[PDB]
């Protein structure tokens, strides 16, 4: 068959026994792919080849680089995207996302050099002086950190992790100026590395003065979304929404869960956020590493029940930084993220600094296409419906009804006509197997649609005819030509179209089953 | 609500039902229910279909019933907003076997005793002279089928007979269950296979009579093969090719070949009268649930027929068993429930129709819809018909917003049939200009028919909204929804038939 | 072919479509049969005919009748019961029950529609205390309204009659609302559709039946659906089509026993009605969705930390896996057998016992076939336990339940006494 | 709550995922076996003693390298380090010894030492029996004299873990075009993902290799490169009479062994999804499909599955695993794996102890988050109605243990099958198996949820005080290991006469 022999079972155990590797995919990719842009992927020549490989969102990590650096790669990103803006049938939009530095704590300058590297010995002594004079004179005896209140959160007998938590220190003697530490498992040290204090209440603002600069800078560059790092409560997401103000009212706020406080208040944060990012990098240091998988599936399942997007984040094909092929564990982590119900998957250092930025985006596209097919659609569509509440919205009743018609006639796609994208988000939350072709006039809506799994946005640049009925039916024939060209369906097939009864947002209420012309 | 057991533990008797009765009621017209005066009170009490039993009656007598029923339907039918169609059904005679007259007058009776002896004879001399010693039946070849271990039953299976000897004419018998033997009583022969055809020459004239009277359906009695379903369809011809055929299973062969007859018919009637005598009586409940379940899987109507409220022939209140029978027939999934002797000759006709309406809408309000709609979709295939996908997608939205009803514009009713296949909780309003299809709509559960009276407008798009606004007038008046309730409307893209696609969620104006 | 083709369907809808009338049932009937003894069944020779036809417990209505006649019917019921006592293998205990008159308020011929009447008057206390002297096994306390009434009855029968189980008959609107407080206070509930169909509207006497049967099924207590189920059989030798489906659906809904009132007391066809009920209930038992009832009975079941409660659930699970012939249980008070029946197995539960009152009382529960062992007690407790096991095997082979070679499940214990059932073993029939 | 009980009482797979809590600490013991390969980083006795304290259950010897004398000292040091704890049998942990055959592998020759290759140059493969000790960046040499008759113009050969792969442009000698480009070293592995190689699964070198394990009393065999059931037949025939009870594990590493899996599973005692060589013979984006399919079919058949290579690969150079490597082993035991493995992480790594402990903590947390309410239901629905009395006891023992929430299920067994039949229905409670057979105690590490304990006391006379002796032996081991307290209810399974195959009676006894 073609994936369809597995999804036709009465038990979850038999569904696994029917997973055939001789069954190829057929539909398009439903999981968006976010790649981090860096010095290995900044030229317009490579940025164009990434779009032809599967990239949908360009991420800029503002933990490094100056504004002139990020303004250049933004201009380079947009340049390589309009490289295909000629034919509007094959043109694929991509989005630009800003990543916050947040309440980060770093170390000083190792002997006044940005490339120096001291060597901690297994079991040596280390002093952590809160003074200033050694911020450019860091040797294998004294360490300088920029956290002023490091003494007002730690005590004698605490753990301290530096640079991705690879080296660890224990506090023996703790004064008020410094704190004597012993290397519990050391190695190579470096300059400006991140330090983690698991088990302490760090009182950093989580919306500092540097965050105001890059947020205001991001509004001026017209970015589509923001990844606020280290969100600990709903108060912080509210602080982000106020800083963006009226100029940035239409950009999406995605909260990065990275510490124990944010996990304990996930329901608090989700209700105030537009999306969630499972940032497993920092999260794996503040909590035990063996518990990360429990927190991941917990957040994917909760936001799936609310219809809000979540991303899987760092270290998915990390070995591909120095190798053209990933490892067996990495080939399964991406597959098991789509199966959990993730909306997008992300690449960080794999596309920013690695030696094979293209083959990493190619590998993610291959695995996600296979994982989307072997999804138990009988159990998923029933559970999400049974847990969904009774609604008075006509759009939601049309949305859930269109997905039932989608599974009934085994349709090729679901054409939805929206302007803000809200009518398209309500269809994707019920996860139809058929792709959702959301035709829009709003270029921002076309870029922001990459966050809700199943949506394939197309942007129509035609003028508007006088007869509204002719303008409505004009957007549908565009989606028929786009789907027929890209290989989604052929003439004679059956698709589902979603329209409304009046112009303006919030009126999608008619569903028609139309044959493909 | 997740379990079947807790659903039963949560049944409340102080929570009255709402909506309306979705299960249809078929009543048999007889000497006690024949006047145009009483027939007007049967429609007001819950009647939907009129059945004429052609087992005894000439064509002149039945033409008066049809002329009387239609007089009562279109009687106070000046308001189409409150007009309820009433269908007409013809029950075939079939290969019946009757006895002879007792001592010269159907009125006399003899007293048979257990362990005594009786003789059966086909010699037509004894015809109007059957006594307690010699019995006559109109089955000529009643000897080439029954062996020396046969078992004959007379008068609703109440008098048993054991065929001791046999021969050519005669057959010696020993009475097993005695009683009062009358004249012209029915005879049932279990085990043996009858040689009389299911479509006799007397039935051929009975069927051509129905084509000329504009009858909506026929109830063919005693069907064993699908060839029997083909003989009736042939004589109905192209002039009556639109009437629906409802096959009756009353024998062991018809049940053993039910799958064959289901594909060669439009509907099914579980005629439990003769069926309870042909097979063991304790096995009838197995056969009823098997047929209703198989037809629900296919979308064809079923009817539960005889002795539902049998006590109501003499008494004005039914027994506890008859109450738990009508309700358990709706919980089984029957499309309609019937009355026979309760309305044809009993002393309480409208009183039994009221009771069968009280219990039916009480059972619909307790149906476990959560796992019924789920199981129906899981066993129905993926079709290419765009109407099937529009139908299954419309009633799924009917559950999401707790819709008031589902308005469907149908010409031949085939659209509304596909909607009712999945059994939503909301009522299905069907608007049509075809009176035959508005009468034939009670065969399917949940479809409330409404016939339109206004002429066709010039603009077709204006013709659709004229009928959509009519169904909400019949609904707001009857009490199906109020001002501001979300409902489901179903239409198509072009005039004609077979183009239903469009589904619109709209509030009541 | 006990309708096992339908007992393996994936959906409940498909389970109906597999019901084959040509699939004969097993030889064991689980639903109890209760007959009301009257002028048409007071003989000692027809009462022997009502045995071997299906009667399990004889109901004696006390709304009219004197103690001299009631004790005479009790005298001949026991006479026709010990008729077969000249065979410990084929013998079958028969119980006796007392339906108290209660607050009837007649004016010469029944009829009538708070009543302010007591739960038990002087005529009730005398009739109730009369059952203690006559060794009745169970009482049908009529017209209960609250737990106040069930307690006011258990007090008048004090110490000599404590093991006698009371059965609350729901008959009015009060008990329909205060059902839960009357359930936990009683030992079993009877659904009297006759006296209840007049009070509540007729069109609703089926939601109350199904609701009461399921709640008692959940809690694990007996339920009985009683009056007019074969009413036409009083004057006619055949039942109607509606009556045959009434008894069938009653067994399907989950009733423990079915009752007959006027059909056996005053009527022309008494022995015939006792056989139609046996024929029907044997067929409705084969057409049961065991795959859904057992999983739902356990899903709502608690986490009772009783060692005997856990071995019961495990024994019913071990019987479905091997298609066993029966579940053998050694019990002294029936409680060990009442817990294996709570989870509704398919095989019969043969309960061996020496207590004769527990054998007669085992008819209140579904699927329990009690047999009484008359052999003397052995000096070695081990040889005495394995003796009652072999006695149960020969009984099953005689009544045609299994053959030398089939598998059975035996429940025994670690210590002589009561409340120590914790040993389950799978052994082949020798 | 604790032990993730909140997620267990759910009614949907979705809501069960939202109720997962990280403040719900695991309470039960670890129910997943651990296999670590021994090498220069873990060969010494003192380092071997620490690996047991960390949770090592099976020591695997890899026979693609090393001599017979080299492996003989490895088996000696393993056995020496484990009876270091045999003083008190109330805390002794058994340990199995696994055999991994070299099998049919093709490897290149020496060079000149590495030589880079271009993105589109030419390399002529030479099968000349020159025994190339000099292979420059043009002319390579293999030891497979059949690649000419097993490939055609347009084929593909992978070199060095599938890092460098060429295409078969022309033929007749073996000219090829570099379709990848890398650094080719001396004596590297080669993979031919196509036609059938005529190399024997049991080659002359492996015949003396399997006989060596029979003479050394190994406990299991990891047959490398199994494609047909005749291979599992031929391997069992080579073990012969002396090694009758050695469990054969067939490694699925190519496309033939996957298309004939039902044939190989029915003829083997177990399976291992060797994701290493398999990710080269098949597309890397499809190995996850084969992983979940092969696990689900053994759970349906009651046989063990091992997930093998590259589970914690980064722990070779760093002391902490990547967040993608922590999710791999958690989903592995969530898919139904019986044991997890480590290859180069314990043989030549720099942090071997930290790898064993990391695999221990993850599996313990992941076993607590298993949806048993659906797992136990589907396991019975697909298991057929057998009339094996020992099968009905096990299904009844697990059903009873869920009703009373037993702390353990004590099972006595002489061969192991009694405990294996209980484990196949996946009880949440740990299965305490008691036996006097050391081999049966060591092999029981292959079945998920079995805690083997060896009884060294002599056999008593009366068959009554001797059964209650071994039941109390599990009672004290449970109280010592902190499984339950004096007063809790347990499930004890026993027979009716000495000997195997009489597991029939189940008892619910209180802990004294
Ligand atoms: O998704 P939203 O923002 O509610 O918008 C959907 C709306 O789009 C509309 O097509 C409005 O039409 P225009 O965009 O062409 O004005 C209506 O179909 C519907 O109300
Ligand atoms: O007869 P069917 O198959 O039920 O279809 C009903 C038809 O009614 C329509 O609404 C048009 O009917 P009219 O021609 O009477 O206006 C179509 O959309 C549809 O094809
Ligand atoms: O049903 P009950 O009253 O709990 O009986 C259970 C008892 O029966 C036994 O099997 C044996 O009872 P006896 O010693 O009285 O013969 C015990 O194991 C157990 O305690
Ligand atoms: O597990 P196996 O090998 O099938 O046999 C287990 C048997 O061993 C027993 O422990 C008794 O045999 P032993 O003589 O070895 O103690 C019983 O519990 C059981 O019948």
Closest CA to B57 of B87, B29, B35: B29
- Residue D318 among the catalytic residues: no
Q: Answer yes or no: are the C-beta atoms of D151 and D194 closer than 8 Å.
A: yes
Please report how many Cα atoms fall inside a 13 Å half-sphere around the Cα of residue A271, on the Cβ side.
Answer: 6
Distance from CA of C409 to the nearest CA of D (A): 10
Size of interface A-B (CB pairs under 8 A): 85
Chain C residues with beta carbon closer than 8 angstroms to that of B283? 21, 283
Cα A207 from chain centroid?
21
**Could you give the CA distance from residue B25 to residue B356 in angstroms, rounded to a whole number?**
8
Structure obtained using: X-ray
Q: Answer yes or no: are the C-beta atoms of D408 and D188 closer than 8 Å.
A: no
Q: Answer yes or no: are the C-beta atoms of A433 and A406 closer than 8 Å.
A: yes
Question: Using alpha carbons only, how large is chain B's radius of gyration in Å?
Answer: 25
CATH number of D1-29+367-512: 3.40.1380.20
Looking at the DSSP assignment, which residues form a beta bridge with residue C327?
A: C349, C409
- Residue D119 among the catalytic residues: no
Length of chain D: 512
**Could you give the CA distance from residue D490 to residue C116 in angstroms, rounded to a whole number?**
54
Sign of the Cα pseudo-torsion (B332, B334, B336, B341, in order): negative
**Could you give the CA distance from residue D271 to residue D248 in angstroms, rounded to a whole number?**
8
Instruction: Give the residue from chain A lying closest to D374, CA to CA.
Output: A12
Fold of domain C1-28+285-430: Pyruvate Kinase; Chain: A, domain 1 (3.40.1380)
**Could you give the CA distance from residue A110 to residue A192 in angstroms, rounded to a whole number?**
8
* Residues 6+ positions from A176 with CB-CB distance below 8 Å: A151
Q: Answer yes or no: are the C-beta atoms of A252 and A240 closer than 8 Å.
A: no
Q: DSSP 3-state assignment of C370?
A: strand
Give which of B190, B282, B328 to mutate to test C binding, by max C Cβ within 10 Å: B282
**Could you give the CA distance from residue C218 to residue A204 in angstroms, rounded to a whole number?**
57
Fold of domain A103-205: M1 Pyruvate Kinase; Domain 3 (2.40.33)
* Residues 6+ positions from C367 with CB-CB distance below 8 Å: C30, C341, C344, C345, C348, C349
DSSP letter, residue D22 = T
Per the annotation, does C171 bind a ligand? yes
Phi and psi at residue B196, to the nearest 5°: -70, 140
Fold of domain D104-200: M1 Pyruvate Kinase; Domain 3 (2.40.33)
Residues with CB under 6 A from ligand 2: B 409-415, 463, 491-492, 495-500
Closest CA to C128 of C73, C78, C69, C62: C62
Q: Token digits for D398? A: 């697990």
Q: Answer yes or no: are the C-beta atoms of A514 and B501 closer than 8 Å.
A: yes
Closest CA to D224 of D178, D271, D260: D271
Residue of A393, A401, A409 lying closest to B396 (CB–CB): A401
Nearest 5°: the CA angle A208, A210, A212 is 75
CATH number of C29-102+119-284: 3.20.20.60
Q: Answer yes or no: are the C-beta atoms of A508 and A417 closer than 8 Å.
A: yes
CATH number of A1-28+372-517: 3.40.1380.20
Q: Answer yes or no: are the C-beta atoms of C225 and C255 closer than 8 Å.
A: yes
**Could you give the CA distance from residue D219 to residue D239 in angstroms, rounded to a whole number?**
12
* Residues 6+ positions from B292 with CB-CB distance below 8 Å: B270, B302, B304, B332, B333, B334, C16
**Could you give the CA distance from residue A71 to residue A216 in angstroms, rounded to a whole number?**
13
Question: Using alpha carbons only, how large is chain D's radius of gyration in Å?
Answer: 25
Instruction: Give the residue from chain D lying closest to A278, CA to CA.
Output: D323
CATH of B1-20+364-509, one of 3.40.1380.20, 3.30.70.3270, 3.40.640.10, 3.40.50.1820: 3.40.1380.20
DSSP assignment of A414-454 equals EEEE-SSSHHHHHHHTT--SS-EEEEES-HHHHHHGGGSTT
Q: Token digits for D255? A: 């496309």
- C423 and chain D in contact, CB less than 8 A: yes
Sign of the Cα pseudo-torsion (D326, D328, D332, D338, in order): negative
Pocket of ligand 3, candidates C163, C336, C391: which has the most ligand atoms within 8 Å of its Cβ, to mutate? C336
Nearest ligand to the C-alpha atom of residue A510 = 1
Sign of the Cα pseudo-torsion (A500, A501, A505, A509, in order): negative
Instruction: Give the residue from chain C lying closest to D399, CA to CA.
Output: C314
Closest CA to C180 of C228, C214, C134: C214
Q: Token digits for C139? A: 């009482």
Q: Answer yes or no: are the C-beta atoms of B400 and A394 closer than 8 Å.
A: no
The answer to whether the Cβ–Cβ distance between B359 and C206 falls below 8 Å is: yes
**Could you give the CA distance from residue B233 to residue A146 in angstroms, rounded to a whole number?**
93
Cβ-in-10-Å burial (0-12, 13-18, 19+) of C322 comes to buried
Q: DSSP 3-state assignment of A224?
A: coil
Per DSSP (E only), the strands in D161-278 are: 164-167, 175-178, 183-184, 189-191, 220-223, 247-252, 270-273
Fold of domain B95-197: M1 Pyruvate Kinase; Domain 3 (2.40.33)
Domain ranges of chain A: 1-28+372-517, 29-102+206-371, 103-205
* Residues 6+ positions from B287 with CB-CB distance below 8 Å: B249, B255, B270, B275, B279, C19, C21
**Could you give the CA distance from residue A231 to residue A240 in angstroms, rounded to a whole number?**
10
Per the annotation, does B256 bind a ligand? no
For chain A, the distance separating the N- and C-terminal CA atoms, rounded to the nearest angstrom, is 27
The answer to whether the Cβ–Cβ distance between C314 and D399 falls below 8 Å is: yes
**Could you give the CA distance from residue C343 to residue C319 in angstroms, rounded to a whole number?**
12
Q: What is the largest CA-CA distance in chain A?
A: 80
Q: Which C residues, 284 through 323, put their C-beta within 8 Å of a C-beta on chain B? A: 284, 287, 292-293, 296-297, 299-300
Q: Token digits for D274? A: 């060797």
* Residues 6+ positions from B412 with CB-CB distance below 8 Å: B434, B437, B497
**Could you give the CA distance from residue D97 to residue D75 in angstroms, rounded to a whole number?**
8
Give, in order, the Cα–Cα distances in Å from C317 to each of C177, C300, D490.
Answer: 36, 16, 18
**Could you give the CA distance from residue D35 to residue D360 in angstroms, rounded to a whole number?**
11
Q: Given in angstroms, what resolution was this structure solved at?
A: 2.8
- Residue D309 among the catalytic residues: yes
Q: Answer yes or no: are the C-beta atoms of A351 and A365 closer than 8 Å.
A: no
CATH number of B21-94+198-363: 3.20.20.60
Q: Whose CA is nearest to atom 3 of ligand 1?
A: A505
Phi and psi at residue A62, to the nearest 5°: -85, 20
**Could you give the CA distance from residue C175 to residue C178 in angstroms, rounded to a whole number?**
5
CATH number of A29-102+206-371: 3.20.20.60
Q: Answer yes or no: are the C-beta atoms of B198 and B231 closer than 8 Å.
A: yes
Looking at the DSSP assignment, which residues form a beta bridge with residue D432?
A: D410, D451
Architecture of domain D30-103+201-366: Alpha-Beta Barrel (3.20)
Q: Token digits for C6? A: 């339908």
Strand order in the sheet with A125-128: A142-143, A125-128, A179-185, A167-174, A159-162, A195-196
Summary count for chain A: helices (H), strands (E): 17, 19
Closest CA to D60 of D93, D95, D101, D100: D100
Closest CA to B429 of B468, B372, B374: B468
Residues of B identified as active-site:
51, 98, 248, 306
């Amino acid at each position: 068959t073609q994936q369809l022999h597995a999804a036709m079972a009465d038990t979850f155990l038999e569904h696994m026994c029917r997973l055939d590797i001789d069954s190829p995919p057929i539909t398009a990719r439903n999981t968006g792919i976010i790649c981090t842009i860096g010095p290995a992927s900044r030229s317009v020549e490579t940025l164009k080849e990434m779009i032809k490989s599967g990239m949908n969102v360009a991420r800029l990590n503002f933990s490094h680089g100056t504004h002139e650096y990020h303004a250049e790669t933004i201009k380079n990103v947009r340049t390589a995207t309009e490289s295909f803006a000629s034919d509007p049938i094959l043109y694929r939009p991509v989005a630009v996302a800003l990543d916050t530095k947040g309440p980060e704590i770093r170390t000083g300058l190792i002997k006044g050099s940005g490339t120096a590297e001291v060597e901690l010995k297994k079991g040596a002594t280390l002093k952590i002086t809160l003074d200033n004079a050694y911020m450019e004179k860091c040797d294998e005896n004294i360490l300088w950190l920029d956290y002023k209140n490091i003494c007002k959160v730690v005590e004698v007998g605490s753990k301290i992790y530096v640079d991705d938590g690879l080296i660890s220190l224990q506090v023996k003697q703790k004064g008020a100026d410094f704190l004597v530490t012993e290397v519990e498992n050391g190695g190579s040290l470096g300059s400006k590395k991140g330090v983690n204090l698991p088990g302490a209440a760090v009182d950093l603002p989580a919306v500092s003065e540097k965050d105001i600069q890059d947020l205001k800078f991001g509004v001026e560059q017209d970015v589509d979304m923001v990844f606020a790092s280290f969100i600990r409560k709903a108060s912080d997401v509210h602080e982000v929404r106020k800083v963006l103000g009226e100029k940035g009212k239409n950009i999406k706020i995605i909260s990065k869960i990275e510490n124990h406080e944010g996990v304990r208040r996930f329901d608090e944060i989700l209700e105030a956020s537009d999306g969630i990012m499972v940032a497993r990098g920092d999260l794996g240091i503040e909590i035990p590493a063996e518990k990360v998988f429990l927190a991941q599936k917990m957040m994917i399942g909760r936001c799936n029940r609310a219809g809000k997007p979540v991303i899987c984040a760092t270290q998915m094909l990390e070995s591909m930084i120095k190798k053209p092929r990933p490892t067996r564990a990495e080939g399964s982590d991406v597959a098991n993220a789509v199966l959990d119900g993730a909306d997008c998957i992300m690449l960080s250092g794999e596309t920013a600094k690695g030696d094979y930025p293209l083959e990493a985006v190619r590998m993610q596209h291959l695995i996600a296409r296979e994982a989307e097919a072997a999804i138990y659609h009988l159990q998923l569509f029933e559970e999400l419906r049974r847990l969904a509440p009774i609604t008075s919205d006509p759009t939601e009743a049309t949305a859930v009804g269109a997905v039932e018609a989608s599974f009934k006639c085994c349709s090729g796609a679901i054409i939805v006509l929206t302007k803000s994208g809200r009518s398209a988000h309500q269809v994707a939350r019920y996860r139809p197997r058929a792709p959702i072709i959301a035709v829009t006039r709003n270029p921002q809506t076309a870029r922001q649609a990459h966050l809700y799994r199943g949506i394939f946005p197309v942007l129509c640049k035609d003028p508007v005819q006088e007869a509204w009925a002719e303008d409505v039916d004009l957007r549908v024939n565009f989606a028929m030509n786009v789907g027929k060209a890209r290989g989604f369906f052929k003439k004679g097939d059956v698709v589902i179209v979603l329209t409304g009864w009046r112009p303006g947002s919030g009126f999608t209420n008619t569903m028609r089953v139309v044959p493909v012309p």
